[PDB]
Write a protein that binds this ligand. Structure first.
Ligand SMILES: O=C(O)[C@H]1CNC[C@@H](O)[C@@H]1O
Ligand SMILES: O=C(O)[C@H]1CNC[C@@H](O)[C@@H]1O
Lengths: 620, 620
C-alpha cells in the first residue's frame, strides 16, 4: 500500500531514468511483442517525462488511438545493486501500461495519474538492461476518466438525424471521445526511476497525523502542545525503529524508539511542545526521520509533515480552529509542449502566480497532480483540494463493477500517496457526475457515491473532509451533493445559461443561494467563469471579451459576499488549457484568468485587487 | 408597385436628407407621439444612413429593445417644389417605422430591408420642415426575419431544467432574440431623400427584359441579334413615350416611339443587332432612356440594363447559353461602426476583393442589400442570388397569416425593386426554413413554400430561376428543396457534425451527393465553412485554426469536383460579421475567409489560387 517517494540517503539511492527515450506508435488494440525483446526498429525520440502527443509534428499524435511503445537502455554499477532490493517506479503512465525488462513481463497497471512500481531485483542484470514500456491511451465507458464509446466528445456538436452523418459515423477512424473537457494527453507523463532499499528489512510506508492541538495561539502560529501520531509499516523477512522529529532548522525536538510488531508495524504518539503550526500563507514543516535499528542504521526515510488541524463545524471550515475562506481556482497540469507532462519550472512559476494573485488554494482538477507540486505547496503555504480522475461519470458507470473498482483504487491510491501533506485539506471523490433527475436516478447516484465517501474517510488517517464537485444541475432533485462535508458547486449562470445577462445571472444565483442557505453546510464555488480571448475588448463587454470576464466576477462575487455560510471562491480556471477540438473550444478552454502562457487577463488584475483585501482567516 | 431609384435630370431633382440627425431612445412598446410636433428634447446625434446600435458607447444601444425616434429639419427653395410632385423615400428603416412630417402622420411600414415612400406634396411647406421617424427594432414569432418570443437566440446555450434559471427568465430584461445568426442591427440603415417628378404625368416604373438571343458568339461576347422588351408604367392625370437604347459609349443604337394606353402603360419589343452581351467577368451595360412626350420633354428616366439570358437546362445553369459555374460566397451588409448601414466605400472595396479572389458571384444573405451594390455588380460583372429576409422560419410561422403576408410583400417588393439588374440570375425565397421531419411537417412546409415559388416566378418579367436555401437537414424527409429550380444546400460536414474529421466529413458528403445525383437537378453549395480566428495556427490544423479552414475547403472541393451536376460553390462567409453574443460566437461569426476588416486568412489565399484556375463557363 505504501508508495513513499524515492529517496537517497546513507541506506538508499535513486537512479533516475528520465531523458530522451526511443519510441514507436503501435496499433489500436495491440503492439508487437518482439518490441520488448530487442531494440525498437526505426525509433523516434521521445522525452520523458512528457505527454507524447505534442512532441512530434511529423505525425499527428493528437489523433492517435491505442498503444505506443517506449524503450531505453540503462546500466548501473554492480557494486550498488549488490545485496539491495531494486524497485522500478513509474510516477505516472497515462492511462495503462505493460512494462518489460530484458524481455520479461514485469506487470501492468491501469490508472493514468498515480504511481506504480515493480521489484526488479531478479530481472536486472549487469551491463546494459533493456526497458520497454507499452502505454495505452484508450478511454471509454469503463475507464476513469470516462470516454464515450460513440457519438461525440463532451460538449461537441452533432447533426445526428442526418442519414449521411449516421452512416459516416459507422466507418470513421476510431478516436478517443473524452466525456471530460480536457485533452486526453497520454504517455509517460511523470518521472521514471530505479531505486534501492535494504532487502532484509525496510521501511515501506509512513503516516503522520496531527491528532490534537492544545491551546492554539491567537494568530495560529503555535500551539501550547501538539499531539502527533506516527504509523510506520515495514517490509522484508525484537526489532525497533527510532523516530526523530526535526523542526524547520533541522533541530531534533522529539524522539522515541518504538517496537516493531507483526504487516510489521510500529505506531505511537509524540507530544510536541510549543509546536509551530502550518497555515495557509505561513507554512511551517517538520521532518519525521524513521531509522530502522539493528550504532549503525539499517534503513532510513525522512518524511516531511506539517502540524495543523482541519475541521468542518457548522457552516465554517476551520484550519487550526480559525474560519478559513478559500481564494483560488481549479488548475490543470497543462502546458504547450509538455501536454500533461510534469514540469517543475512551471510548477514553481505557477506557485509564484498564486502568490501574486493573493490566492491561497486550488483544486487538482480533475486528477491527482505530480507529487512535486504538493511538496511545493507544503513549503509555500497553499491549500489543496485533492481530486481523483472520476470525471465524466453517469448512471452507465454506476452499474459497472469494473468502474466501481477503479474508482475505489483511485481513492485509496490518491490518499495513500498524499496523506502526509499538510497542504491537503479536503478530498474530492468526483467531478460533475450525474446526480439529479427523476425516478430512481438520484437514489442510484447516492447509493453509488455514499460508500466512496465512507472509503475516503476510512482511508485518510487525518480524517479530512470529503466532498464531491457538483455540476450545474437541478439542485432540488440531487440528493447526494447536500450530504457531503462541504458543498462544492460548479455554476455558470450568465455563461451557459442566461447568456450575457449578468442581472438575470445574479438573480438566478441568488435563488439557488437561498436554497443552500437552509442546508446548514459550508458551501463554496469550485468553478465559475467565462471563456475570454485576450485582446478582445469592448466598452460594454460581451461574451469572450476581457471586460465581460472581469464584470462576470465582479457581479457574482458581490452576491456571494452577502452569504456568511459561503466559505470559498475557486473559479474556473487558473489558465487556458487544451481540449478536444470542437465548436465551443477556441484553441482549447479559454476560461483561464491567465493565458496558456500564464499572462494575466483584465480579470486577473481585478481578482488580484479583490483577493489582496480578503484575509485567509476571519473574512466571514 | 414601381420603386425606381430617385434620379436627377432636366425634369426631376433629388434632395438628399442624409447627415447627422437628432435621436432619442424610447420605450419597449411605445414612444411619445408629441415628439413629432416640436424638436426632440435633449437629443443625441445619430448619423444617417447607419445602424444606431454602434453609434453610442455611452448607452448600450446593442441592448435596446423597442422604439427609437429620429428627427431632422430641412428646407428647399419654393421655386423647385412649385408645381411638382414631392416624394419622400426611405431606402430602408429597420424593421418598422412611423413617419411624421410637420406633425402629420404620413404612414407606417414594416419590412426592414426594402424601400418605401410617401407623397408629401401636401404636407410640405415653405421654410423649415420637421421630419420625425420612429423606428421599431422588435422581432418575434411574427416578423421576418424571425425572432424568438422566449428562450434563447439562435444556437444559444441554456440549462432550462435548473429551477433558478426558469424563474430568472420570467423577470429578465426584455431583449430581441434573433432566430438567425446575425446581429439585429436597427435604424435608418439606408439613405433618405426627397425627390420630385412632374405632377400631371410621370414615369412610374420601367421593366426591361431580354426576350431572345439569336446566333450567340462562341465566346458569348455578342449575339447576331437580341430581342429586348420594355414595359413602362405612368402615373398622373393619345400620349407617347420615346424609348432610346444607348450603348456603353452613349451612342443611340435603337429607338422606338410607343403609344401610352390605359393603367397607363407602354410596352413593346426592340431588336438590337450585334448586341453586346452581359457576362460574369465581362460586364456590358446599355441604357434605356424613356422620355414622355407632349420638341419639349415632359419627363425622363434613364434605366441601366444588360442583355443576357438565364436558363436552367437539366443539370446545367446557362447564361447566354453557356454552362456557368458559381464561385463565391454568402455576404452580409456588416462592418465595424456602420453595422448594417450602407457604405459605398466598403461596397467598392468588397467588389475589388471579389475580383482579387477570382470569385464571380455572391448571395445577398439574408435580406436584400442596398440598391447601390447591385448597380456596382452590374458594372463589375459579378452575378447575384437575390434573397428575401425570410430567415429563422419554421412551422410556427407557416400557420401565421401576418407572416405569410410579410413574406409575400418581401418577395414582390424585392423583385419589383431589382428586376432590371442583369447581375441577378436567381431569386431565393428563404434561408434555412424548417422543411423535414415526420408526420405532416414536410407537407406543411411544401404547402407554405410552393405558392411563394410560384409568386416569385410570376413577379419577375425575366422569369429567372427560383430557389430556397436549405439548411443541413434530413434530406430524405424534406420534400420541398428538391422541387426548386436549382438545389441550393448549406452543409457543415466536419464542422457542426463529425467535428474535425475531414475523412468522415467527405464520406458523409459523398453519401448525400449520391442522393442528389438521383434527383437530377443542378445542385450548388450556398454555404459551407469553419470558424477561424486569424493568427491561430497549427502544423495539423484543428478547428478555429487558419490551416483547418484551408484544409476544409481543400477536401470538400475535391469531392464536388467529381460531380458534373454540381454547378457552384458559394462558401460561408466572405467576411467575419457581428452576431448576438453566445458561447459559439467569438466576437461574432468567424467563418469569414476574410476578417471583419477584410484581410485575407490562409484559406482566402488558397481559394484565390483555386478560383484563378476555374473558368466562369465550361468548367463542367
Ligand atoms: O465547461 C467548462 O468550462 C468546465 C465545466 N466544468 C468541468 C470543467 O472540466 C469544464 O472545463
Ligand atoms: O452557422 C452558421 O455559421 C451559418 C449557418 N447558416 C445560416 C447562416 O446565417 C449562419 O451564419
Amino acid at each position: 500500500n505504501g508508495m513513499l517517494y524515492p529517496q537517497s540517503n546513507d541506506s538508499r539511492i535513486v537512479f533516475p531514468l528520465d531523458g530522451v527515450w526511443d519510441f514507436r506508435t503501435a496499433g489500436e488494440d495491440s503492439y508487437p511483442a518482439e518490441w520488448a525483446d530487442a531494440p525498437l526498429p526505426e525509433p523516434l525520440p521521445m522525452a520523458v517525462p512528457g505527454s507524447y502527443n505534442d512532441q512530434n509534428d511529423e505525425l499527428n499524435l493528437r489523433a492517435h488511438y491505442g498503444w505506443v511503445v517506449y524503450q531505453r537502455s540503462f546500466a548501473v554499477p554492480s557494486r550498488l545493486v549488490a545485496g539491495q532490493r531494486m524497485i522500478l517506479r513509474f510516477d505516472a503512465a497515462t492511462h495503462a501500461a505493460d512494462v518489460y525488462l530484458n524481455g520479461q513481463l514485469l506487470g501492468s497497471h491501469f490508472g493514468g495519474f498515480l504511481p506504480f512500481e515493480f521489484d526488479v531485483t531478479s530481472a536486472l542484470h549487469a551491463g546494459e538492461n533493456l526497458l520497454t514500456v507499452a502505454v495505452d491511451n484508450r478511454i471509454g465507458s469503463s475507464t476513469l476518466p470516462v470516454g464515450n464509446d460513440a457519438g461525440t466528445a463532451f460538449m461537441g456538436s452533432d447533426n445526428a438525424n442526418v442519414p449521411a452523418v449516421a452512416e459516416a459515423k459507422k466507418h470513421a477512424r476510431r478516436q478517443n471521445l473524452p466525456n471530460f473537457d480536457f485533452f486526453n494527453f497520454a504517455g509517460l507523463n511523470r518521472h521514471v526511476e530505479l531505486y534501492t532499499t535494504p532487502a532484509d528489512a525496510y521501511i515501506a510506508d509512513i503516516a503522520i497525523t496531527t491528532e490534537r492541538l492544545d491551546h492554539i495561539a491567537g494568530d495560529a502560529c503555535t500551539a501550547a502542545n501538539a499531539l502527533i501520531a506516527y504509523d510506520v509499516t515495514f517490509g522484508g523477512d525484537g526489532r525497533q525503529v527510532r523516530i526523530s522529529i526535526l523542526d524547520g532548522e533541522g533541530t531534533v525536538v522529539a524522539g522515541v524508539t518504538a517496537d516493531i510488531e507483526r504487516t510489521a508495524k510500529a505506531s505511537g504518539e509524540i507530544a510536541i511542545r510549543d509546536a509551530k503550526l502550518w497555515n495557509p500563507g505561513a507554512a511551517y514543516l517538520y521532518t519525521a526521520v524513521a531509522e530502522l535499528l539493528p550504532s549503525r542504521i539499517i534503513d532510513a526515510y525522512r518524511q516531511t509533515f506539517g502540524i495543523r488541524t482541519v475541521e468542518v463545524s457548522g457552516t465554517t471550515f476551520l484550519i487550526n480552529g480559525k474560519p478559513f475562506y478559500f481564494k483560488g481556482f481549479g488548475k490543470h497540469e497543462d502546458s504547450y509542449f509538455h501536454g500533461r507532462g510534469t514540469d517543475d519550472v512551471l510548477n514553481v512559476k505557477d506557485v509564484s502566480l498564486i502568490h501574486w494573485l493573493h490566492a491561497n488554494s486550488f483544486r487538482t482538477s480533475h486528477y491527482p497532480y505530480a507529487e512535486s507540486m504538493y511538496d511545493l505547496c507544503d513549503r509555500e503555504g497553499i491549500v489543496i483540494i485533492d481530486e481523483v480522475p472520476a470525471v465524466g461519470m453517469s448512471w452507465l458507470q454506476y452499474a459497472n463493477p469494473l468502474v466501481a473498482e477503479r474508482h475505489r483504487e483511485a481513492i485509496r491510491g490518491m490518499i495513500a500517496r498524499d496523506k502526509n501533506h499538510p497542504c491537503i485539506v479536503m478530498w474530492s471523490i468526483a467531478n460533475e457526475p450525474g446526480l439529479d433527475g427523476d425516478g430512481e436516478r438520484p437514489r442510484q447516484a447516492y447509493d453509488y457515491f455514499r460508500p466512496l465517501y465512507e472509503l475516503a474517510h476510512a482511508s485518510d488517517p487525518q480524517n479530512r473532509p470529503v466532498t464531491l464537485v457538483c455540476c450545474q444541475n437541478d439542485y432540488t432533485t440531487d440528493i447526494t451533493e447536500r450530504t457531503m462535508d462541504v458543498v462544492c458547486i460548479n455554476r455558470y449562470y450568465g455563461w451557459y445559461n442566461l447568456s450575457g445577462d449578468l442581472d438575470a445571472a445574479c438573480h438566478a444565483l441568488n435563488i439557488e443561494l437561498d436554497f443552500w442557505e437552509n442546508i446548514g453546510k459550508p458551501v463554496m464555488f469550485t468553478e465559475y467563469g467565462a471563456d475570454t480571448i485576450e485582446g478582445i475588448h469592448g466598452t460594454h463587454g460581451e461574451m469572450f471579451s476581457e471586460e465581460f470576464q472581469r464584470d462576470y466576477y465582479a457581479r457574482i462575487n458581490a452576491e456571494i459576499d452577502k452569504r456568511p455560510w459561503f466559505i470559498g471562491e475557486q473559479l474556473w480556471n487558473f489558465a487556458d488549457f487544451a481540449t478536444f477540438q470542437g465548436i465551443i473550444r477556441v484553441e482549447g478552454n479559454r476560461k483561464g484568468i491567465l493565458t496558456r502562457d500564464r499572462q494575466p487577463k483584465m480579470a486577473a488584475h481585478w481578482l488580484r485587487e479583490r483577493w489582496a483585501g480578503i484575509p485567509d482567516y476571519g473574512y466571514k
